[PDB]
Structure formats: structure tokens, C-alpha cells
Amino acid sequence: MENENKPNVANFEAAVAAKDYEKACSELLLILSQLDSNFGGIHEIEFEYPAQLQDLEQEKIVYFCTRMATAITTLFSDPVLEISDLGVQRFLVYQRWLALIFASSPFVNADHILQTYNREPSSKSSLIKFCILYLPESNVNLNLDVMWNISPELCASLCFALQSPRFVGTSTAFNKRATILQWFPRHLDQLKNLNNIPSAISHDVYAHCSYDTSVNKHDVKRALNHVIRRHIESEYGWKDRDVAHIGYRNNKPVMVVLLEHFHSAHSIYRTHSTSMIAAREHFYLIGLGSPSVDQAGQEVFDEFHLVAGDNMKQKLEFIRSVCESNGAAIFYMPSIGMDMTTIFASNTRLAPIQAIALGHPATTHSDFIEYVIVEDDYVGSEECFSETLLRLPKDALPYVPSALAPEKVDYLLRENPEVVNIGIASTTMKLNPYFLEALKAIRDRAKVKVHFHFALGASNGITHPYVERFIKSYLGDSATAHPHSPYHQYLRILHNCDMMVNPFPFGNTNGIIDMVTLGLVGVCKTGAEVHEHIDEGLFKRLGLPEWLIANTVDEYVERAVRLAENHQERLELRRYIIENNGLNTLFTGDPRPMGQVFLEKLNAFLKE
Ligand SMILES: O=c1ccn([C@@H]2O[C@H](COP(=O)(O)OP(=O)(O)O[C@H]3O[C@H](CO)[C@@H](O)[C@H](O)[C@H]3O)[C@@H](O)[C@H]2O)c(=O)[nH]1
């Protein structure tokens, strides 16, 4: 009737008390949906609160979470409650938002509701219901092999949902995802289509694997590729392109670029636009993207078109029709994994040369992509990548500064401070028990008092209270969790610090430019994967001693403790960076190599 799709806590609660299980679920699913669209934000969800919490936002958020947790408790403990296999689908996709509802509440998890399902001190619904509430923070045990027998598609639907959370830093949650990342690949490979699994969080599953510490963390991507490939053939009737003969525009071979989060106020653009603007010396560039791409982002390309269609099928047909019409010789995605469109297109053939760049630093594991554009100074092991790494010179991707960069600076070089303030520039995905245990060691081993200021991205609304407890569980009073801040307030948090540090499994790119902008020095850890190694390359590009670059976690702790302890040695490094920072080297170079290496690889092919 009216406002029948408006998320409202009182209506959810009313339907529960009234035992109208259908309205109760549908009202729950409205709220969960809103939390999804708002990335955990509780604004746009209608509720009232005691006056005391008016200006206490964290407490107002925990209040939201507790009120929802208690109503979900009443509902899901009712054995009368039945859920459609359609409800299980949607509920599982919002399971992460269910997870944050319980994790930011005093309850931590939904295990108290899970224990009511035990009638052995019963129904498919009971199981379904068990899976809906088997949250990343559950301490309940689960055999996944037993579950795969009972229901192969339901098990996959949960493994997908335990891979969807952006922040899984808790040992309890990180372990579930690490276990799933080892177990689930061989089982996902067995499915034939995406019709009975949580499709909509496929991309999450595809990208969040890169935040694990295992060497084979990317396995799950190949299996997903296969299923996607089986899906597009079977459900879309996908037929690949004749990539035998190419075509020409303005007497140059055609590069078709599929775009992903390519707005000019973003790193992706800042990091890969120069490389594509210069590839126009040898290619006609047709850009395919969303309306999110602004004019600057479209001006990269000779031609820009919006990816049209209402489903992946029509959109994949558009990308094909363009490549087919222009006989595109190169299919290029600067970023693969943020939007499903690229991931699906990665499992098709639309041009003889198909390549990605590392806008997301992870191998595709797709047979339909041959090359990976990457800078030499950022590669560790090339064996981390199914594709052939097209390693370009360290000057080959000149960056574009953001217009947000300050023009003026004040350097706080604290002579022997009583407390050493250490900055952390991290998003929730980058947080893990290994990183946090290393940070505990630094506090514990240092002969100087230290404080850790965390500037957290994606730590908003319901997300932040849960992460705050996580950080406090390791460092307590030696750590402040700042939620997401505007750039100028984010730099002020960092400005307050004496040195900085970053998560080792997945390093920082912008965080380092931020560190150096403020004349700060810090410690990173390098590794085989590019997302480990970038930090090393970027340190060297900017002029950072390699003693500040660790290979092991134990060294990471050693060198940071040293940076904290030796006040004057820290300040000499800061004064060195302040005077000879290579921040300008980041914004200069020759971006033409990429367009050249593509032409050679194409020309060789054309000749055979
Ligand atoms: O409270 C906050 C927290 C963060 N930020 C901003 O967020 C940025 C950091 O974003 P982040 O996600 O850490 O970017 P990086 O991780 O440094 O770069 C990533 O994105 C690049 C896109 O090209 C990839 O190539 C890199 O591999 C990948 O690490 C900073 O510039 C901050 O200005 C804020 O403004 N306020």
C-alpha cells in the first residue's frame, strides 16, 4: 500500500510480536537491504531512541544493533518460523549485515539462537535457519563435507556468505574464511551454474580472497571462473568471437577497454589513465563503462560508450557487439574484480589479445586472459600469476596527483616524545590477526610507550563498533580506532603521529603517498604477491631505506620497534624524506611502453 517498502525498526518489531512471520521476514529483509546500500549506515532506516543517545552516534548505533539482535532472536528461535528457499537466498546475501548486527551488539554472535535448534541434549528450515545465522563470529562447529552431501548448493551459498564480509580481522572470522579458501574451491568447481547460489556477492568472493595470508588464496577464483564460463554458455548462449581477423579505425588497430570504478577522483584513474592515453599513439581506444566515469575519465579514450543491458547477458552482448563491430584486437581491463561485468567478460573471448592491469592486485586465473600489465618494481614472484606478466619500466605508469593534495605543510618532528604515536592507514579488509598480533608485539617489545592511531576506511555505521572491539582486544588503551574521516581530518590524524605502519599481507599505495606527503617514515613488509611488493617498490621510488622494508613478520616487528625507540634516527630519516622526497617521480615518466608492447604482441600474432 504505502511506505510498504520503507525500512522501519518498529514495524519489524511489531511483526515479530504479532508472530506474522511473513511480514517479520520481509521487514527484516528491508532493513538488511538498506544496510547493504548504505555500506552499514543506519541512516535511511527509521527508528527512535532515548534522548540520551541523540549526540552519541556510536552508542546510537550499538542501540540499533541490540534492538535488531533481540528481535531477530525472538523470530528465529520460534520453531514455527519457516523460510522460503528464496528467503534463504536473500537472507544469506545479507548474512554479513546480520553478522555486523550481532557483532556490534553486546551479543557478539547468533549462537544463542543456534543452540535452540538442538533437539538432542530437525527440519530443512532448521538447517536453512542454522546456515542463515552461522555467522563469521560463530563458535559453533560445522563440518563442511557433511554439509556438502546434505546440500551442495546450500553449503556453497554459506561459503559465499562467509567470504562476503569486508572486515574479517577476528581470528574467529579469519579462520573460517581461510578454511573456506582451502576447502571450497574444489567443491565450487563441481557446480554447473550460478542459479541457486548467492550470485550477487560473487565479485566480493572473487576479490576478498586476496586479503588472506595463504599462498593459494586465489584458488577460489579459477573455480568461480569455470562456473561463470559454464553459466554464460548454458544460460546466456554465449558464443565467443572470431578473433582471427582484426579491424582498423583511423588506420590503427582497435583497443576496447572495459572500465571499473574509473572516476577521475580515484586511484584507478590516477594510476592507469596516463598509460591508456599514450596507447593511442598506436591504437584506437574505445572505452566501455558506467555513467560513474566522469568527463575526464571518458576523455582518456578516442570513443566512450555506456555498457548497455539490464542483465549480464545483454551487457556481455554489448561488449561483444562493439568488439565485433570494431574487430577489436586488444581487450583491456585496468581493474578486474570490483564489478562482476569485468569478471564475466574475463571468461569470454572478444579479441585476440586480452589483458588486465592490477587495479585489483590479483591474478584472474582465467584462460582467456594472456597478459598482465604491471610495473617491474612491484613484482615479487611471477609465479603468483596465471597470466604472463607484462612487466613495464618503473616510469611506465605515471600517476595523476589528486586535486585534494595539500599545497602547504607543517612538519612536526617531535624530539624524544614520551609516547610514540604510530599511524595505521588501513581499510577493514586489510585487517587480520597476523597484522594485529605483530602490532601487539611492537607495543610489548618496545622500550618506549607507543600508541597506534588507526585511520580506518569502510569502518562506518555498524561496522566500526565491531572493529573497535577487535583492535582493543589486542592493544586496548594503546590504540585508538578512528572511523572513516574526510581527507583533511584523515591527514590530521596522521599528522599527529611520529611514524606509521601498514598491514603486511596487503600493502598500501595511497597510504604511502600520504605518509610521504606529511614527511613521515614507516615500516612495511614485502612479499611475493604484487599487493605485498608495491610497498617495497614505492618505498624505493620515494627514497626509503631498505631497512624499513621487512621480509618476515619478525623483522617487521624488529624494525618498527627500532623506529619507535631511536628518536633521533627516526627524525634524521624524516628530515631526509622532507628534503628529498621523490613524490614528483611518481607523477613523471614515459607512459608509452604499454601501447608499444601491445602492438608488438599483436603484430607477431597477425603475422603468424
Ligand atoms: O578515514 C579515511 C581513510 C582513508 N581515506 C582515503 O583513502 C585512501 C587510501 O585508500 P586505499 O584503499 O588504502 O588505497 P591503496 O590501498 O593505497 O591503493 C589500492 O588501490 C589501488 C588502485 O589503483 C591499487 O592499485 C592498490 O594496489 C591498492 O592497494 C587515502 O588516500 C585516503 O585519502 C580517507 O580519506 N579517510
Q: Closest residue (by CA) to atom 26 of ligand 1?
A: 509
User: In terms of domains, do 141 and 160 share one?
Assistant: yes
**Domain annotation covers residue 67:** yes
**Domain annotation covers residue 506:** yes
User: In terms of domains, do 47 and 140 share one?
Assistant: yes
- CA 36 – ligand 1 centroid, Å: 21
Angle (CA) 516-478-170 rounded to 5° is 90
Which residue bears the cell 520481509?
A: 26
For 121, residues 6+ apart whose C-beta sits below 8 A from its C-beta are none
* CA gap 162, 52 in Å, rounded: 36
User: In terms of domains, do 598 and 552 share one?
Assistant: no
User: In terms of domains, do 30 and 159 share one?
Assistant: yes
Structural Rg of the chain based on CA atoms? 25
User: In terms of domains, do 569 and 529 share one?
Assistant: yes
- 548 near 523, Cβ under 8 Å? yes
Q: Closest residue (by CA) to atom 23 of ligand 1?
A: 268
Q: Closest residue (by CA) to atom 19 of ligand 1?
A: 509
* CA gap 98, 235 in Å, rounded: 31
Which atom of ligand 1 is the closest one to the Cα of 402?
31
Which residue bears the cell 547460489?
A: 197
- CA 267 – ligand 1 centroid, Å: 7
For 12, residues 6+ apart whose C-beta sits below 8 A from its C-beta are 24, 27, 28, 30, 31, 68, 71
- 335 near 261, Cβ under 8 Å? yes
Q: Which of 204, 222, 240 is the last residue of a domain?
A: 204
* Strand pairing class (252-258; 248-249): antiparallel
Give the containing element (helix H, strand E) for 306: strand 303-306
Q: Closest residue (by CA) to atom 24 of ligand 1?
A: 359
3-state SS track over 563-577: HHHCHHHHHHHHHHH
**Domain annotation covers residue 493:** yes
- CA 56 – ligand 1 centroid, Å: 28
- CA 18 – ligand 1 centroid, Å: 47
Q: Which of 171, 204, 237 is the last residue of a domain?
A: 204
User: Taking CB atoms and a 6 Å cutoff, what residues make up the pocket around ligand 1?
Assistant: 267-268, 271, 358-359, 361, 427, 455, 457, 484-485, 487, 490, 508-511, 514, 531, 534
- CA 262 – ligand 1 centroid, Å: 14
585's grid cell? 617521480
Which residue bears the cell 511483526?
A: 15
**Domain annotation covers residue 39:** yes
- CA 510 – ligand 1 centroid, Å: 5
**Three-class DSSP category at 168:** coil
* CA gap 236, 314 in Å, rounded: 9
Q: Closest residue (by CA) to atom 18 of ligand 1?
A: 509
For 144-173, b/e burial (b = at least 16 CB within 10 A) is eeebbeebbebbbbbbbbbbbbbbbbbebb
Q: What is each CA distance from 453 to 151, 485, 508, in whole angstroms?
A: 45, 13, 16
Q: What is the DSSP string of 485-499?
A: --HHHHHHHHHT-SE
How far the first Cα of the chain sits from its last, in Å, is 66
User: In terms of domains, do 179 and 41 share one?
Assistant: yes
Q: What is the DSSP string of 410-438?
A: -----SS-SEEEEEEEEEGGG--HHHHHH
Q: Which of 172, 204, 236 is the last residue of a domain?
A: 204
- CA 508 – ligand 1 centroid, Å: 7
Q: Closest residue (by CA) to atom 35 of ligand 1?
A: 487
Domain coverage including residue 390: 253-396+588-608
Positive or negative: CA dihedral 378, 178, 176, 89: positive
**Domain annotation covers residue 225:** no
* Burial category of 515 from C-beta neighbours within 10 Å (exposed 0-12, middle 13-18, buried 19 and up): buried
User: In terms of domains, do 381 and 526 share one?
Assistant: no
Cα dihedral angle (363, 365, 368, 370), rounded to 10 degrees?
50
User: In terms of domains, do 26 and 110 share one?
Assistant: yes
Q: Closest residue (by CA) to atom 33 of ligand 1?
A: 487
User: In terms of domains, do 370 and 460 share one?
Assistant: no
User: In terms of domains, do 279 and 347 share one?
Assistant: yes
Q: Give residue 440's identity as a one-letter amino acid code.
A: K
Q: Is 254 left (phi over 0), alpha (psi -120 to 50) or beta?
A: beta
| Strand order across the beta sheet in which 479-482 lies | 479-482, 449-457, 419-427, 499-501, 522-525, 549-550
Q: Closest residue (by CA) to atom 30 of ligand 1?
A: 510
Q: Give residue 449's identity as a one-letter amino acid code.
A: K
Domain count, the chain: 3
User: In terms of domains, do 166 and 19 share one?
Assistant: yes
**Domain annotation covers residue 192:** yes
* CA gap 490, 503 in Å, rounded: 18
**Domain annotation covers residue 113:** yes
* CA gap 179, 147 in Å, rounded: 14
Mutate to test the pocket of ligand 1, among 509, 524, 542 (most ligand atoms within 8 A of CB): 509
**Residue 550 pairs with which residues in a beta bridge?**
525
- 283 near 252, Cβ under 8 Å? yes
**Residue 391 pairs with which residues in a beta bridge?**
374
Q: What is the DSSP string of 227-253?
A: HHHHHHHHHS-------SS--EETTEE
For 289, residues 6+ apart whose C-beta sits below 8 A from its C-beta are 258, 259, 260, 262, 297, 298, 304, 306, 307
- CA 379 – ligand 1 centroid, Å: 20
Nearest to 17 by CA among 67, 51, 63: 67
**Residue 390 pairs with which residues in a beta bridge?**
373
* CA gap 296, 122 in Å, rounded: 58
Which residue bears the cell 583511423?
A: 250
For 517, residues 6+ apart whose C-beta sits below 8 A from its C-beta are 405, 406, 409, 491, 583
- CA 108 – ligand 1 centroid, Å: 29
User: In terms of domains, do 190 and 273 share one?
Assistant: no
Altogether, the residues listed in the chain come to a count of: 608
**Domain annotation covers residue 297:** yes
* CA gap 262, 442 in Å, rounded: 38
